[PDB]
């Protein structure tokens with residue numbers, strides 16, 4: 001039986017998708033992700049801010065099918081490091097992804113299985129091509145929510161563990177009022 | 188070798204992707220597509236208007252990878268029928284597609300291999316899920332350009348021929364200033 005085509009309204013200003021399933025990620029949800037563990041623990045104890053919310057419209061995991069989701073990445077810092085999504089490689093490593101930036105100031109940090117990293121700045125209208133094999137994490141580098149839409153293969157899946165254990169080979173921090181992409185000491 | 192991640196600017200007001208492959212389809216490129224052949228012939232001779240332009244960013248045809256393209260679908264009618272894209276099934280029939288409406292007023296006509304049709308209205312912010320097996324054609328029902336972004340599997344390809352020969356089971360026309368989707372009499 002064929003699946004039904006549908007249209008859903010995406011609000012470019014809030015990232016809310018009609019009919020999507022919501023995911024809420026708080027700072028407490030990201031232990032071991034930020035370099036400055038003291039600032040993390042302190043921020044989690046004081047207020048445990050929401051780091052990002054995701055609104056996903058996903059299909060069964062099937063070759064050739066497509067999922068899509070917006071993310072609203074909140075502004076903030078853990079010590080010097082800007083708020084980011086957990087990041088992942090795809091379970092089917094060779095699956096690509098396309099991101100479309102809708103609101104705010106941010107960027108994407110990507111790395112290969114071997115650790116070689118890339119940084120792609122994102123502003124409203126920027127479309128980012130995430131090639132096969134690249135792990136990817138988005139970072140909010142501004143003062144307002146950073147909102148984007150992502151379209152990804154239905155069978156791409158997720159390898160979060162690799163990133164949770166070793167993180168990214170680079171980190172994105174604020175140094176002298178400037179955004180800088182630098183080596184991860186933890187790496 | 189790993190492919191290079193990149194970002195490109197997509198302009199939401201003009202639909203232009205900076206540096207993408209540009210394709211132009213004029214009314215003369217769509218012979219046999221509109222029901223009113225005499226009206227098609229007449230408009231071609233009088234003006235041969237551009238019906239739509241496409242800006243595509245494509246990868247090699249490999250499983251799990253992704254292409255993206257904007258379309259600028261110009262307003263117009265051939266007889267009573269609104270301007271539309273040629274439309275296709277995918278060569279790998281079960282490949283889905285995601286459309287993001289950016290500007291203007293239009294919609295998507297879809298149909299199964301067995302001819303069952305569906306119409307989905309699109310206004311700015313509408314995201315349409317084009318499931319596996321459904322042929323799909325966009326239509327402009329307003330008086331300004333209808334602009335959208337499409338993300339599709341790199342290996343979907345196109346089967347333009349089926350639609351070229353017999354068309355969609357439905358057409359989108361204007362009757363007494365109103366937009367109507369009705370049975371295609373040449374189907």
Ligand code: NI
Nearest residue numbers: 090097136152
């Ligand atoms: Ni992904």
Ligand code: NI
Nearest residue numbers: 277284323339
């Ligand atoms: Ni298609």
